[PDB]
């Protein structure tokens, strides 16, 4: 009868993750979407390391490359006609929303 | 069991299925080098069944005792071929059929309070053995 819709949020900027809890959850608990707070995911840090010189002739140094990906989880207990407006607004650069229908 | 440490608590229980006729001896108990690391055979069979004491805490804390999750992580402390030492998988063999030696799935139907508690009743007697 009543639906539970878990909505994960992934991005790279933690500020954009601070920007999606800035306005999505506040425009939903006015109508009580049962957010269960900002559910933090552990980050998926990506390390690559490479040499610097093409044609590696001399002083064999290296060069480390880092990448930080972060999520935060918003689960909701509401039917699908409720959450349709929240998918439209608010939108954010670099952030991704994953809600499946079927 | 979570009593005193299972050095000798393994050692007594190895005698008891050997006592009770439930040996269920592998016919190559004097052949196998119990894994791809040993230069010599084991001294005897008295380890081969004895890891019921290990699963009594691993059915308790790790998993239902699947044989692939079993043989991997215990009994690997090896030096393999000389460039350099590495890890092993120990490749058990017949103790896949040591469930028959006891007579989503569960691995023992008597290690809940039935025959594990006998070993507890052995170690409660071993409290009285260690009473002097």
């Amino acid at each position: 009868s009543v639906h539970r819709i878990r909505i994960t949020l992934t991005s790279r900027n933690v500020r954009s993750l601070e920007n999606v809890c800035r306005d999505l959850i506040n425009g939903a608990k006015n109508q009580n979407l049962r957010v269960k707070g900002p559910v933090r995911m552990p980050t998926k840090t990506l390390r690559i390391t490479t040499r610097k010189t093409p044609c590696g002739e001399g002083s064999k140094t290296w060069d480390r490359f880092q990448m930080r990906i972060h999520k935060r989880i918003i689960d909701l207990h509401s039917p699908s006609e409720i959450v349709k407006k929240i998918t439209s607004i608010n939108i954010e650069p670099g952030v991704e929303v994953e809600v499946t229908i079927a | 069991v979570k009593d005193i440490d299972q050095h000798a608590v393994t050692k007594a229980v190895a005698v008891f299925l050997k006592k009770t006729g439930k040996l269920k001896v592998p016919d190559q108990m004097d052949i196998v080098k119990t894994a791809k690391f040993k230069e010599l055979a084991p001294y005897d069979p008295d380890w081969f069944y004895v890891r019921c004491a290990s699963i009594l805490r691993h059915l308790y804390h790790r998993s239902p005792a699947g044989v692939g999750s079993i043989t991997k992580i215990y009994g690997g402390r090896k030096r393999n071929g000389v460039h350099p030492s590495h890890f092993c998988r120990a490749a058990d063999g017949a103790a896949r059929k040591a469930l028959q030696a006891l007579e989503g799935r569960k691995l023992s139907s008597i290690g809940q309070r039935d025959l594990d508690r006998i070993a507890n009743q052995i170690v409660f007697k071993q409290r009285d053995a260690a009473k002097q």
């Binding site: 490479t50 610097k52 093409p54 480390r64 880092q66 | -």
Partner: protein
């Protein structure tokens, strides 16, 4: 049909360098296929700020 051997779906040949088509210096496996010296040029803006 003819004179083209090498059933290329085994070995390094030929899963080679979908960013520069250069063989002998390849980063193959991260889902990149980048020819790591070209990854120097195109480190950005495919993330990958250095930190430490």
């Amino acid at each position: 049909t003819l004179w083209y051997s090498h059933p290329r779906k085994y070995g390094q040949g030929s899963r080679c360098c979908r960013a520069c088509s250069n063989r002998h210096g390849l980063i193959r496996k991260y889902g990149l296929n980048i020819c790591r010296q070209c990854f120097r040029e195109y480190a950005n803006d495919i993330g990958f700020k250095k930190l430490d």
